[PDB]
Amino acid sequence: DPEVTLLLQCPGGGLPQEQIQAELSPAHDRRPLPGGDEAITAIWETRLKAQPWLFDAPKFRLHSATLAPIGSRGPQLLLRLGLTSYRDFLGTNWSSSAAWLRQQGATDWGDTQAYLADPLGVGAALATADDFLVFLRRSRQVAEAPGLVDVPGGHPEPQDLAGQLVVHELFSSVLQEICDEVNLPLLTLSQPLLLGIARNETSAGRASAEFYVQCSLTSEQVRKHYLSGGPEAHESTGIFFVETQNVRRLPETEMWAELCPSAKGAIILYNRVQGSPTGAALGSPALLPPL
Ligand SMILES: O=C(NCCc1ccc(F)cc1)c1ccco1
């Protein structure tokens, strides 16, 4: 799967909010482009002159994520975050020249991402009360991965002492994206666990934080809520469900070729961190069938 790389796999079946620190610092920002940020301004001008209803928005930038030694007390993850924007994204990661920016970043800074916006995404492995994961079909009109299968998620917008508020907005944002797109009540959702971070190599390496969320509704109830919103209540064109039993071997199915890179990241991390039992009971052949 060359289109996705794992940057982080969380321990202990995934990390809760209270175990994560953020450092939000202008040291974690994109570096100015070698020939100047005028190239970004020029792409943005061209785009607004064809689609003048477009608007910019701030985004978090992922610089890096350091895990503590396993089994330790205290905070288990440090996220190093800067600030970027939708405009910077369109001028770097989504540029035809994005691979040239990665090579120049390697040369100048020893960092393939130094010249890339790299806005941070969130996604969820969302499980139902009857043990299915939730999948969504993308419109055939979107710029990236058109008509592909996705999971719930989005790209959160800004507004350990500013740090704890930033971790809170990240966890809050994945629940809000579930409520907005799947049309579920907030009180049917568990507090999220962070499974890990995955990079989309088809989008010049921009990362997404992948979470586990449990819903108290059945697959049939989730479907009713999604559909009862009508076509205008969601960006996706359909919803569907796969038994958690069957998610284990999804990379061997014809579905795998239809999954967008960030959804592949969510499913790989779900299988490694929530699946793959460690103990004698769940590890026994009748509960963990060989092959
Ligand atoms: O609108 C786009 N993507 C929506 C998701 C998103 C990605 C990155 C972001 F920074 C903010 C939102 C798009 C245009 C060209 C390539 O993708």
Side-chain angles (χ1 to χ4, degrees), residues 1-72 74-140 142-158 161-290:
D1 288 311
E3 77 258 41
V4 54
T5 69
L6 306 179
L7 302 192
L8 168 67
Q9 174 175 333
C10 288
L15 294 179
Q17 195 184 315
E18 297 72 24
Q19 291 178 23
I20 299 161
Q21 177 175 5
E23 177 171 38
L24 181 57
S25 169
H28 302 146
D29 284 1
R30 188 186 41 87
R31 298 299 109 229
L33 297 189
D37 281 1
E38 290 102 322
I40 296 169
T41 296
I43 283 157
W44 183 240
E45 292 287 329
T46 300
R47 178 55 73 91
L48 288 177
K49 282 176 179 166
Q51 301 189 322
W53 56 88
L54 286 183
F55 56 90
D56 200 7
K59 300 286 162 189
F60 297 106
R61 181 169 190 274
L62 180 68
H63 171 277
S64 58
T66 293
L67 200 72
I70 51 163
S72 62
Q76 289 303 108
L77 184 61
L78 177 60
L79 301 174
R80 299 188 193 76
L81 299 182
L83 292 179
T84 188
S85 67
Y86 188 53
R87 177 181 161 278
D88 285 6
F89 163 75
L90 286 181
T92 60
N93 294 81
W94 191 238
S95 171
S96 48
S97 302
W100 290 7
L101 291 176
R102 287 185 103 180
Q103 182 184 15
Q104 273 311 317
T107 296
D108 297 350
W109 299 90
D111 176 6
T112 56
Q113 313 307 110
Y115 296 130
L116 288 180
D118 277 2
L120 182 65
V122 301
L126 173 63
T128 63
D130 62 334
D131 298 308
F132 291 80
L133 295 194
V134 182
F135 294 91
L136 301 168
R137 179 65 69 172
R138 291 179 64 76
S139 174
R140 276 160 317 204
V142 292
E144 291 183 300
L148 295 192
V149 177
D150 212 348
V151 292
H155 303 83
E157 284 176 30
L161 260 65
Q164 287 302 98
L165 285 178
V166 167
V167 179
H168 184 263
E169 159 67 334
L170 293 180
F171 281 75
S172 285
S173 77
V174 69
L175 298 175
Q176 191 65 52
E177 291 293 347
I178 293 164
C179 298
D180 294 348
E181 180 68 10
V182 191
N183 202 31
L184 298 180
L186 182 60
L187 294 181
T188 66
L189 303 180
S190 70
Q191 288 302 323
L193 297 172
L194 182 66
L195 302 170
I197 301 171
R199 138 179 307 175
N200 183 348
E201 301 295 3
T202 74
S203 212
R206 67 181 172 95
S208 293
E210 303 295 355
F211 295 83
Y212 176 53
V213 178
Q214 179 68 52
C215 185
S216 61
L217 307 177
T218 67
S219 59
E220 130 200 318
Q221 290 174 315
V222 168
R223 187 194 257 107
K224 164 197 149 306
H225 279 270
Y226 173 86
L227 288 171
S228 81
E232 301 305 55
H234 37 80
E235 171 151 0
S236 66
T237 64
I239 189 162
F240 70 88
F241 307 83
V242 182
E243 304 92 324
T244 60
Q245 173 189 270
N246 295 330
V247 172
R248 186 182 176 207
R249 302 194 72 171
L250 213 59
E252 296 169 81
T253 71
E254 292 185 325
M255 192 176 143
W256 196 246
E258 302 195 28
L259 261 193
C260 72
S262 59
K264 286 183 177 193
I267 300 309
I268 293 162
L269 284 165
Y270 174 85
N271 283 336
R272 288 181 73 117
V273 174
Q274 278 291 313
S276 303
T278 26
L282 285 193
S284 292
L287 280 180
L288 192 73

